[PDB]
Design a protein around this nucleic acid. Structure first.
Ligand code: NA
Ligand code: NA
Lengths: 72, 72
DNA sequence: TCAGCCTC
DNA sequence: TCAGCCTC
């Protein structure tokens, strides 16, 4: 119902696995759920990288799982 | 029992599919069966490319199938 | 995931 | 097969 936000963290060397070829993999996840999903560049000394999900309660929920399924 | 030969033909753009990364895929097939498997370069006007299996009756037989399974 | 794997 | 996919 209400439009909120979350931030997860995955290692910088799982970036390629879940982004996709010309970033086609991520585009799939975005349009499927309707979650505003954004992957960040790693800081000065950063093994992890932030993912910034942004939709309603439900829109965010699915994305949580879908972004552990191109790690397959 | 007796050591013989066969030649199959696949399109030149199925070469990559069955050869493998640094030709690791083909090396697998060779040692598995014991067949002397060799993939050829395409002639002046050649859509196909020859594969030159060379072992005993049995050694050759398996290779026949295994070289239609990296086309998967 | 799903594209491209070119070797003795 | 089985590696690497870097995008709104
Ligand atoms: Na799901
Ligand atoms: Na077999």
């Amino acid at each position: 119902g209400p439009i909120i936000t979350t931030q997860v963290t995955i290692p910088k060397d799982l970036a390629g696995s879940i982004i996709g070829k010309g970033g086609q993999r991520i585009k799939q996840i975005r349009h499927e759920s309707g979650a505003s999903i954004k992957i960040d560049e790693p800081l000065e000394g950063s093994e992890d990288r932030i993912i910034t999900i942004t939709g309603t309660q439900d829109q965010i929920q699915n994305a949580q799982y879908l972004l552990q399924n191109s790690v397959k």
